[PDB]
Amino acid sequence: ADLSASVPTRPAEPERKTLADYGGYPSALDAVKQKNDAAVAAYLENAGDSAMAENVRNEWLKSLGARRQWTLFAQEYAKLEPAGRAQEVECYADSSRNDYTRAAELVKNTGKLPSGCTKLLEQAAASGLLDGNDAWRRVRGLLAGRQTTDARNLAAALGSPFDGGTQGSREYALLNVIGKEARKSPNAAALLSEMESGLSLEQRSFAWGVLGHYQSQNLNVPAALDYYGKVADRRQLTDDQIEWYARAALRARRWDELASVISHMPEKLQKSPTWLYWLARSRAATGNTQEAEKLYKQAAATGRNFYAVLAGEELGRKIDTRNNVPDAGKNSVRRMAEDGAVKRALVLFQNSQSAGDAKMRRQAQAEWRFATRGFDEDKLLTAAQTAFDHGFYDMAVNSAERTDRKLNYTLRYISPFKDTVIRHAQNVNVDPAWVYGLIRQESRFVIGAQSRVGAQGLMQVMPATAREIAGKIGMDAAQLYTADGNIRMGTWYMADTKRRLQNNEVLATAGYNAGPGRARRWQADTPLEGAVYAETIPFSETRDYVKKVMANAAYYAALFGAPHIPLKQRMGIVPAR
Ligand SMILES: CC(=O)N[C@@H]1[C@@H](O)[C@H](O[C@@H]2O[C@H](CO)[C@@H](O[C@@H]3O[C@H](CO)[C@@H](O[C@@H]4O[C@H](CO)[C@@H](O)[C@H](O)[C@H]4NC(C)=O)[C@H](O)[C@H]3NC(C)=O)[C@H](O)[C@H]2NC(C)=O)[C@@H](CO)O[C@@H]1O
Ligand SMILES: CC(=O)N[C@@H]1[C@@H](O)[C@H](O)[C@@H](CO)O[C@H]1O
């Protein structure tokens, strides 16, 4: 195979123009918030075809839609690239044309939606254009999610308001069971059992789903399964509720019930790597061996993710990190940087480095995603190398991981900084592939990374945690902000957290992100299969984090040439508390 040399040649602008436009970008976003339409229009008038312009235009359109300025809205909406239109902007545009095409899928969402989309659904409901079953499921989901005003407004649009005498008032009164606080009460199940006979099938099913969901996410597995067992129509459940029913069944090793629950999930959820793999494990455990193999093949086909790897291992396939494509040609790598949109991203990236401007760097990321948005796989792999060469490490990974068939593992799983990471890992006796896997997920190798809550650097150590580490290993807490000190702190904390959690690497990974006390709370009174512990982590961020860090670690270990450790063995057994 050759990679194609075809690269885009979009109009380029001088560095001066890119930097001038960025100079005005924060003020343009402020002008949207201040409803200074003349200022926003002036910023966009001579903007390049950039992510800056797209972002300002999208934010402007949300404001124009909220203010029902439809002539100007329609004019600016048409200027967006279709794949660049924000969800809420699309909802406003369709609503302005009385087109409720999107409502049939949007109403399946049981949580907060942007205002334009929330209103699209209310308008569809008032015109009788919503499926009633789905609409009331959304009302219930909003009630259980403390979106009470949105629930009230949708019920009113359905013709049954909360202060009416009918269905809406009954749904609203059920907050004494399904409220965020009510559902935790020791008497919630007794209260629901007393009123059950007066509830509809759908109200009963949803309310038992709320109580089961709370118990399951609290890891009270027997009670969770008792409550979920009372759900007569499982399709009434929110997606989170039915996934937490599956998680309780998985954790209890109820393979039949797990398969039954998965069969009631939306098709989208059934076809996820998670539930393809665990349904396959259920079929294996019940002696449905050929069907297990079929499901493992489907899970393995979903990509490079945690469950695709575990599914491959059940088929006898181990990770193989050789590339199945050649390197991009160097002339194409050079010409890619000449494309106007790629150049703009590289200009903002390089100037963010030289000027120490973290906000400019974030907009450089946005320009990169914008520039590469439509790219076929050959262009993605070419642009990934362009990014890597310029030191734009997170965007090298971003572009390389977006392919489906053409795999360059050296750009998906970059490993800069080995002259620092490897020795710090060795010094505390921790697996370097695990450290690289953790860095990839934490920062994507961005030296200056800072999360919204203040986690800092390559290894995303919190200032309060850095303070404690510094006091234990003879450092100044400000070394958190240097690459070498950050890696020393993060590796030491991986090792210390592991020591505190029965020396288990799965617990340590969870504890790094959620705190050691959380990781320990999530253990059971008996041992847990490692992937079962991971899939039943109550915090969605940490659950996703553990699977991504451990899958990354498996790829790094293969690239590093370490003795082979199957991912299922890396997950191993999480000990009883
Ligand atoms: C929004 C979001 O999720 N951002 C995450 C960010 O949370 C991740 O950072 C991790 O956060 C967790 C949760 O706060 C940190 O856990 C705490 O860690 C400290 C230090 O180990 C624990 O305090 C100590 O507890 C012992 C036991 O009782 C006491 O003896 C000590 O006195 C006490 N020390 C101090 C200084 O108080 C604390 O209990 C943990 N919290 C909980 C709830 O268990 C964790 O350290 C932190 N990780 C790092 C590497 O800093 C971040 C990284 O994944 O990602 C996101 O930005
Ligand atoms: C810069 C930033 O926000 N990085 C976060 C990190 O803080 C978090 O621990 C991790 C969890 O998946 O996800 C990364 O994207």
Side-chain angles (χ1 to χ4, degrees), residues 442 451 453 455 459-462 464-465 467-468 493 511-518 541 545:
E442 285 290 10
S451 82
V453 293
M459 300 198 65
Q460 289 290 282
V461 178
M462 296 288 301
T465 298
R467 172 170 22 61
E468 169 192 70
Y493 192 68
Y512 189 97
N513 181 247
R518 263 77 170 272
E541 170 211 30
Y545 175 92

Side-chain angles (χ1 to χ4, degrees), residues 70-341:
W70 296 116
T71 303
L72 185 47
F73 183 105
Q75 167 191 292
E76 295 297 317
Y77 173 90
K79 298 181 181 172
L80 290 167
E81 172 76 12
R85 297 158 187 166
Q87 180 191 38
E88 192 181 12
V89 170
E90 293 281 37
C91 290
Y92 273 131
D94 289 3
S95 285
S96 78
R97 300 192 171 83
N98 322 303
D99 171 13
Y100 299 104
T101 293
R102 293 178 186 274
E105 273 297 302
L106 279 171
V107 72
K108 304 285 194 179
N109 194 310
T110 52
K112 184 60 142 196
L113 286 168
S115 180
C117 296
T118 303
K119 286 169 145 170
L120 182 155
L121 285 178
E122 292 165 7
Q123 295 164 23
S127 284
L129 301 175
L130 286 190
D131 176 80
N133 175 83
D134 294 340
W136 284 107
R137 173 175 175 273
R138 175 169 167 74
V139 169
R140 295 188 194 100
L142 293 164
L143 282 169
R146 270 235 197 279
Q147 296 297 334
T148 318
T149 293
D150 287 348
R152 181 180 319 266
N153 288 339
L154 182 55
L158 293 164
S160 188
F162 285 178
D163 74 339
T166 53
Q167 173 168 10
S169 61
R170 195 63 194 75
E171 306 288 352
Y172 181 54
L174 209 34
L175 284 172
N176 65 340
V177 171
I178 70 167
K180 267 294 186 312
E181 278 307 308
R183 75 189 66 176
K184 317 179 197 303
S185 163
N187 200 258
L191 182 56
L192 179 55
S193 295
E194 291 179 7
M195 77 188 64
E196 261 193 302
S197 65
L199 299 175
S200 73
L201 167 67
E202 292 79 11
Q203 291 156 358
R204 285 197 303 264
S205 293
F206 188 87
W208 282 115
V210 171
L211 301 194
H213 180 195
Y214 172 75
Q215 294 301 325
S216 188
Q217 208 167 7
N218 205 39
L219 299 178
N220 191 14
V221 173
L225 288 167
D226 183 54
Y227 296 172
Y228 274 128
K230 295 175 191 277
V231 174
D233 180 6
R234 294 159 166 176
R235 305 198 192 263
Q236 296 303 318
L237 300 179
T238 71
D239 290 356
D240 286 338
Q241 285 166 0
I242 198 165
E243 289 193 285
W244 274 100
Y245 188 177
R247 285 174 183 123
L250 174 66
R251 198 154 155 138
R253 311 194 298 277
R254 291 191 186 181
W255 295 110
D256 276 337
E257 189 163 10
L258 174 63
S260 184
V261 172
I262 289 166
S263 76
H264 285 89
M265 298 181 175
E267 190 70 17
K268 299 191 217 274
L269 280 189
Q270 295 196 38
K271 293 273 169 143
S272 71
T274 299
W275 302 122
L276 289 172
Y277 172 81
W278 286 119
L279 185 59
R281 283 282 305 273
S282 171
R283 267 68 173 100
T286 59
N288 295 94
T289 302
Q290 286 183 61
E291 183 69 1
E293 166 169 342
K294 179 175 175 191
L295 291 159
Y296 285 133
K297 284 177 177 168
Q298 298 182 5
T302 64
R304 269 47 62 179
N305 62 80
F306 182 84
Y307 285 115
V309 172
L310 289 180
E313 291 181 2
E314 296 302 315
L315 298 166
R317 308 170 183 174
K318 70 187 239 183
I319 279 175
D320 177 1
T321 51
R322 78 173 297 274
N323 301 342
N324 67 3
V325 283
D327 297 354
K330 294 315 181 189
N331 186 62
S332 299
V333 173
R334 176 186 172 177
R335 296 321 159 178
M336 178 62 78
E338 299 176 359
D339 169 83

Side-chain angles (χ1 to χ4, degrees), residues 304-500:
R304 269 47 62 179
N305 62 80
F306 182 84
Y307 285 115
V309 172
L310 289 180
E313 291 181 2
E314 296 302 315
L315 298 166
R317 308 170 183 174
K318 70 187 239 183
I319 279 175
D320 177 1
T321 51
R322 78 173 297 274
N323 301 342
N324 67 3
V325 283
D327 297 354
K330 294 315 181 189
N331 186 62
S332 299
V333 173
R334 176 186 172 177
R335 296 321 159 178
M336 178 62 78
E338 299 176 359
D339 169 83
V342 177
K343 174 187 186 190
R344 185 184 293 113
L346 292 173
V347 165
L348 291 184
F349 173 64
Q350 275 179 330
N351 280 276
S352 79
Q353 302 178 295
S354 63
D357 188 338
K359 289 192 170 156
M360 188 186 285
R361 193 199 193 282
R362 184 180 156 215
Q363 186 57 29
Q365 293 175 315
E367 297 295 340
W368 188 270
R369 300 183 200 106
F370 168 91
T372 59
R373 184 156 58 203
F375 278 9
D376 58 46
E377 298 199 2
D378 302 40
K379 287 180 182 65
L380 288 172
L381 290 173
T382 303
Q385 188 69 48
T386 303
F388 185 87
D389 292 348
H390 288 78
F392 206 174
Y393 289 131
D394 50 337
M395 292 303 99
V397 177
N398 182 275
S399 290
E401 75 181 348
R402 276 172 54 205
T403 71
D404 285 305
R405 303 171 60 84
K406 295 185 181 186
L407 302 178
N408 186 313
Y409 288 95
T410 38
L411 289 161
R412 283 178 177 248
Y413 299 94
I414 61 170
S415 51
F417 316 131
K418 279 193 181 181
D419 66 4
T420 305
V421 175
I422 299 299
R423 63 183 170 87
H424 284 306
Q426 288 171 353
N427 288 341
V428 289
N429 288 328
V430 296
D431 183 352
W434 181 32
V435 180
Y436 266 92
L438 189 143
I439 294 165
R440 181 179 192 264
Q441 171 64 19
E442 285 290 10
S443 64
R444 285 288 199 271
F445 299 95
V446 176
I447 290 280
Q450 188 182 284
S451 82
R452 185 159 174 294
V453 293
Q456 173 70 28
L458 285 170
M459 300 198 65
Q460 289 290 282
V461 178
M462 296 288 301
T465 298
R467 172 170 22 61
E468 169 192 70
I469 294 166
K472 294 183 167 176
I473 59 176
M475 298 171 74
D476 182 271
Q479 296 180 254
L480 171 66
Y481 298 87
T482 67
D484 184 71
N486 191 268
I487 294 165
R488 168 61 173 157
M489 286 178 170
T491 56
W492 186 88
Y493 192 68
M494 289 172 71
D496 184 70
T497 300
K498 185 159 70 76
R499 292 179 67 199
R500 289 174 189 283

